[PDB]
């Protein structure tokens, strides 16, 4: 789950939408698999078919989130010609939130997910620009 992020981040932004779309869809698929596995372990499905249907629905939802997020961000950075900008990732996060609202079939979840995932995606671009560390190695 480390080499997937390094596969995503090495491409320059706003250059090739297809490779970034595939990489972000891979991130979404991995997130969906781990979430669905925890879901079927902790909450037992009714039968086999229900379990595989729930797992597939979860990974398709998260794969859609990643795919359209990466496509929207790369398209925006291509059109604007400003690749090192958090605005592209803000539009990508809102497009992903709209996708989550369409997957859940509700507008309130869509609007809330647009706002919050846009804020988090913009903050992620800011951290990538300025080298913010979350799991920072000890210094002193």
């Amino acid at each position: 789950a480390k080499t997937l992020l390094h596969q995503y981040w090495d491409i320059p932004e706003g250059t090739e939408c297809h490779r970034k779309t595939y990489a972000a869809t891979s991130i979404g698929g991995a997130s969906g698999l781990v979430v669905s596995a925890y879901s079927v372990a902790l909450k037992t499905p009714t039968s086999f078919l229900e379990g595989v249907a729930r797992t597939g629905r979860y990974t398709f939802t998260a794969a859609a989130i990643g795919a359209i997020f990466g496509l929207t961000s790369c398209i925006s950075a291509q059109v604007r010609e400003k690749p090192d900008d958090p605005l592209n990732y803000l539009i990508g996060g809102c497009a992903g939130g709209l996708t989550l609202g369409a997957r859940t079939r509700s507008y309130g979840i869509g609007a809330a997910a647009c706002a919050y995932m846009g804020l988090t995606a913009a903050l992620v671009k800011m951290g990538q620009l300025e080298g913010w560390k979350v799991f920072a190695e000890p210094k002193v």
């Binding site: 979350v134 000890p138 210094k139």
Partner: protein
């Protein structure tokens, strides 16, 4: 229970803890862990109800599996090292297995499931002994092997347990489940700082032990185990309501009370190394912990819930309980903040 047998079992529990604490051998560490677990099993079976059997079985299975992982990590270190000394591990596989074993022993998420159930199913005194004494030997062993723990794994465990404990503490009306989720959050707080400065972890351990001991002694003295049973204390002894009010205010990290000192020093230590997002997230989940503390103190102190008729019969009798060290521990749990540089003695 025979008091001689109970005294012998308690001294054996303490003996296992010091055998872990003073040994220079991994096998002796493991022996101390085994003897501690097998001596604290019957303390949890003091009242002999089915819930005690359930709690003892779940605790036994969790500690057994954690001990197996501990022994596997020890044996892999023996393979790749040829020695036995309690220091850093010479293999990342052994370090990861040892970290998960000590996380399972500490009740850290996502190995946190047994803690509220085990805490609920046993009496209040056994829960106090569990949540205070049993959470020292894994912390000691984690203090010994801090050169070898993977930072990402331990930080993931710490923030995961903080978030999960703070979220799970919002849906409980029993006091023991509330205390278990609070314990999970506090172990996340301590181990988030262990790789940066372990003196902060020792200070947090001491303050958390004092605070939760004061609260468990208060609950034992009032003989209340649910919030609706706690709400009768204003008709029984209002001073105990004042005491639980100030201790719940301190437990949420509200200054100028002594419970804010650990979180303040954790934030102080973790920003010397340019980690700013993480202490902010831990602060917000500490706010969630303060929320369910505020709900409890609204129930017991700041309002007068309706009482019953037999409370008059309880008024006519003065208490004869053995509230050992309750005022000293309450004072230490409330007003230890102007003596903050005392923490240097743990260096």
């Amino acid at each position: 229970m025979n008091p001689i047998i109970l005294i012998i079992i308690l001294m054996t529990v303490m003996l296992g803890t010091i055998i872990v604490m003073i040994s220079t051998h991994w096998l002796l560490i493991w022996i101390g862990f085994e003897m501690n677990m097998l001596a604290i099993i019957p303390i949890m079976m003091k009242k002999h109800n089915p819930r005690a059997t359930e709690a003892s079985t779940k605790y036994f299975l969790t500690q057994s599996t954690a001990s197996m992982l501990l022994m596997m990590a020890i044996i892999i270190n023996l393979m790749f090292s040829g020695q036995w000394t309690v220091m850093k591990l010479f293999n990342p596989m052994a370090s990861m297995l040892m970290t998960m074993a000590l996380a399972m022993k500490l009740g850290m998420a996502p190995f946190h499931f047994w803690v509220p159930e085990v805490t609920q199913g046993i009496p209040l005194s056994s829960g106090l002994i569990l949540l205070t004494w049993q959470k020292l030997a894994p912390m000691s062993v984690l203090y010994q092997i801090l050169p070898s723990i993977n930072l990402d794994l331990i930080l993931t465990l710490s923030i995961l347990s903080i978030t999960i404990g703070g979220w799970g503490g919002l849906n409980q009306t029993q006091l023991r489940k509330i205390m278990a989720y609070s314990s999970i959050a506090h172990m996340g707080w301590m181990t988030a700082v262990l790789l940066y400065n372990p003196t902060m972890t020792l200070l947090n351990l001491i303050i958390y032990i004092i605070m939760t001991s004061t609260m468990f002694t208060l609950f034992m003295a009032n003989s209340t185990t649910t919030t609706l049973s706690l709400s009768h204390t204003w008709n029984k002894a209002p001073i105990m309501t004042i005491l639980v009010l100030i201790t719940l205010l301190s437990m949420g990290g509200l200054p100028p009370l002594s419970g804010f000192m650990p979180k303040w020093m954790i934030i102080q230590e973790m920003t010397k190394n340019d980690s700013i997002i993480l202490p902010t997230l831990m602060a917000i989940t500490a706010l969630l912990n303060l929320y369910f503390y505020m709900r409890l103190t609204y129930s017991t102190a700041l309002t007068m819930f309706p009482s019953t008729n037999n409370m008059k019969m309880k008024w006519q009798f003065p208490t004869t309980k053995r509230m050992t060290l309750l005022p000293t521990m309450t004072v230490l749990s409330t007003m230890l903040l102007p003596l903050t540089p005392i923490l240097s003695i743990l260096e």
